[PDB]
Amino acid sequence: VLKTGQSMTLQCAQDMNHEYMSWYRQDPGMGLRLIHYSVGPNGYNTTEDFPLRLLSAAPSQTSVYFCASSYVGNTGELFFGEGSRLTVLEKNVFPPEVAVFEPSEAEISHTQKATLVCLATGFYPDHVELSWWVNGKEVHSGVSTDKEQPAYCLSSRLRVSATFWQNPRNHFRCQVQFYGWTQDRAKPVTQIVSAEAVLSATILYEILLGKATLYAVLV
Amino acid sequence: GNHLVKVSVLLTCDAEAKNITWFKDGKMIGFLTEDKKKWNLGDPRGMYQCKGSQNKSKPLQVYYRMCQNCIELNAATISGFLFAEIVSIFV
Amino acid sequence: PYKVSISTVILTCPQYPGSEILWQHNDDKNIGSDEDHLSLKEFSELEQVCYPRGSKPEDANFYLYLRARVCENCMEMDVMSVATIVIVDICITGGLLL
Amino acid sequence: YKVSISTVILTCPQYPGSEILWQHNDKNIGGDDKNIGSDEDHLSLFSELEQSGYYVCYPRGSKPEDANFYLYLRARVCENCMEMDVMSVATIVIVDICITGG
Amino acid sequence: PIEELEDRVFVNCNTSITWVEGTVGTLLSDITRLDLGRGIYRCNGDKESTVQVHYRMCQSCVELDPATVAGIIVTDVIAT
Amino acid sequence: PAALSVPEGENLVLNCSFTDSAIYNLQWFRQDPGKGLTSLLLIQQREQTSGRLNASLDKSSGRSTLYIAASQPGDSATYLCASYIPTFGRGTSLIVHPYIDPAVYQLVCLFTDFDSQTDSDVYITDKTVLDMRSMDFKSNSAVAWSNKSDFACANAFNNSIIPEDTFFPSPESTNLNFQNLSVIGFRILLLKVAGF
Amino acid sequence: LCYLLDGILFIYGVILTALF
Amino acid sequence: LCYLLDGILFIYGVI
Ligand SMILES: *[C@@H]1O[C@H](CO)[C@@H](O[C@@H]2O[C@H](CO)[C@@H](O[C@@H]3O[C@H](CO)[C@@H](O)[C@H](O)[C@@H]3O)[C@H](O)[C@H]2NC(C)=O)[C@H](O)[C@H]1NC(C)=O
Ligand SMILES: CC(C)CCC[C@@H](C)[C@H]1CC[C@H]2[C@@H]3CC=C4C[C@@H](O)CC[C@]4(C)[C@H]3CC[C@]12C
Ligand SMILES: CC(C)CCC[C@@H](C)[C@H]1CC[C@H]2[C@@H]3CC=C4C[C@@H](O)CC[C@]4(C)[C@H]3CC[C@]12C
Ligand SMILES: *[C@@H]1O[C@H](CO)[C@@H](O)[C@H](O)[C@H]1NC(C)=O
Description:
The complex is a heterooctamer, with one copy of chain A, one copy of chain B, two copies of chain C, one copy of chain E, one copy of chain F and two copies of chain G. Chain C is of the alpha+beta class. Chain C has one domain. Chain C has one helix at residues 81-97, and strands at residues 4-5, 10-12, 21-23, 37-38, 50-52, 63-67. Chain C is elongated, with a radius of gyration of 17 Å. Chain E has one helix at 66-79, and strands at residues 4-5, 8-12, 18-19, 26-27, 33-36, 40-44, 48-53. Chain E has one domain (1-80). Chains in contact: A-B, A-C, A-E, A-F, B-C, B-D, D-E, D-F, E-F, F-H, G-H. Chains A and F meet through β5, β6, α1, β9 and β10 of A and β4, β9, β12 and α2 of F. β7 of chain B pairs parallel with β6 (63-67) of chain C, so a sheet runs across the interface. 2-acetamido-2-deoxy-beta-D-glucopyranose binds next to loops of chain B. Chain G: It comes from Homo sapiens. Chain G: It is found in: Cell membrane. Chain G: The chain crosses the membrane at residues 1-20.
């Protein structure tokens, strides 16, 4: 989380002799930008380490960052970073809150395939945008994502089978992330902000292992 | 700086190499090699720290509560509780 | 080194002697406590370190990981608390036979 | 392959007049620590995702392009656990009726 | 290679798959791919690639510990 | 083309445009929201084929063309064309109709399965399709979110053209990791309490 | 879900035992 | 998973 005037560092690295590294920027919906690099540029500041540093108060970032790394002289296959997104916030500072919407039983009764949607509660300004995660292991199949009061838009959707969503397991960790003070609220950086989505059967079973202990105690 | 101890029940000590030694509550409990980057529980409810640098590193405290449900006396959970309990101790 | 108190359930943050105690949570009316106590009511599994008066939070070297429930008029849930759950079972069979 | 765990045991088919050596998950495997050891017929290992992958035996020199046969053996194998293969619960039931029989 | 995706296990091949005795699955809408709920399936890149597969993490299994192994033996002997 | 929607199994024509010849890089990318760009060609060779893929080249013309045989909902993503920076020549956005159902559910009212052709307290999302690989059956969908004025799905999609037979039940209608296997395991001690 | 039928057959087992 | 329990006791309990 970057409050205005602060500094943020995000790192990229390679270990298989990529002689060229670059940082890419993507404005979600209509923009794609390139960030200057130095293996041996506005609003942003060794061959195995690749740092990205913020040393300006520019509020117009409002984008997603990608890291680049590839060989030179061969066919030229490109390898890209997963992504990174930042923050701009001029007390009044508030990171948008994300929420989870589970499917109902009607969808699985009719079509027998589920659909998961998670939402981030919006505000007048912007700079919140990228995708989400799941089960502490990023699944890369069937993933889909993406006015107001004059005091951006991003909702993700997943196609799921009826036998796939049923569990609390297959845990959907919805988070669009500002990666990373005189207000009663905690510091803006805080941590990963996420809304999380039968295991209660397992918990009940571990509970009646209590009875499994009563039996041994009695005998 | 530091903060090299991070927490599918996995415990990690990143940025280290060669012998990694695991300390649970300050005592020698586990050896980790170069090719392995993870340590697993097998509720951890323990106090842990990792030694790859001089006198270990910044320690971490962990403990886990099983029921992700059980916000309050939830009706479904309460029903499961009362049925299972009544049968189990009437026998 | 963080220990809890049983009562509203309270999480405590013992620290070195400091003229002022500061917290960093991970207009909410549920965020309220006294002394070195910390209490959460209607706790959420969403985004929802503590050090004495100082310059940076890095002085409180020990960090904490927590995934639990803080509630009111609720029994404690822990590995040993299954024995408390054990206690309520043979208590309620005592209630039933009487 | 016939696999049992007591340390797990791997089975590689014997070959006429051929040396024996192993490769695991496209990386080399000893036979370095106590868990890894293999000298006569079998390869001994298991820890979840890290050691899950391809397990096969290789010859000297012509490896690895010659071998079109590769086993994809991904496992969890918790430390000190039970040999149990998907449908082998009845076999696991077979074990304890034997105990009940005696 | 073969892949694990969502609910069921799958066998991936760039060409048609031929099945050797084992747990019989079902053919997917893609002729070159197969689905599972072991068997050896030949594949081509030409070169021929043969893959023998058997998987260990179960939608139906049992795993436990030697102390819990002691528990299970105690239970079945006094359940005799 | 534009975000063209096509039925399953059609032959494709997706084009690039470039005005430079001093380059050695030509590859194709499938884009996911949170997965970046993954490269899917080797034409840096004018006709390379790898499964469902085919491509054609004309450096004289200044335009590249790709062909997909039996395009699937996996093609429902933006397709891109490869200083050494990946100068994306033209690019193209694509969506594929998994034609053979329509129904709106309440979760956040979820319009889905239309398969064709489809004031501030209610917010809606656009039409999407995506590769469902498990059972290889897909579905288009859209979700309407609102909290104010107690919205209902029927009036929420009063702007949208719900298909003629949209199912509207508005007021009505894998284990892993040890402990489940233990549940499969300790039924012995679970049951032997009988008589005891 | 299969656990709810684990119940349904658990009541099946208890009516079995009651008949026994 | 419920065949563990349907396997014998259901068919034994129906008759
Ligand atoms: C890395 O960690 C392993 C953990 O097992 C070390 O193995 C054990 O290392 C100890 C010493 O740390 C060995 O004891 C004795 O060490 C000294 C060496 O000066 C000497 O008195 C003896 O020759 C003996 O080696 C012990 O044998 C060994 N035990 C086992 C079960 O492996 C390993 O040495 C460590 N590597 C290092 C510190 O470079
Ligand atoms: C061996 C077992 C079956 C013991 C018998 C007790 C039965 C009645 C218990 C055990 C497991 C229980 C289930 C465990 C988990 C859940 C999920 C929860 O959200 C609703 C209740 C529900 C679906 C329970 C219903 C009652 C249940 C089936
Ligand atoms: C799943 C955990 C709790 C293991 C314990 C299994 C318990 C719940 C099972 C095993 C033995 C069972 C009992 C065996 C005998 C009878 C007598 C019959 O006329 C009514 C049911 C009743 C009273 C059963 C109720 C359920 C029961 C108590
Ligand atoms: C290292 O040494 C000092 C002095 O012994 C000690 O106070 C400090 O806590 C140690 N560092 C750790 C344990 O991380």
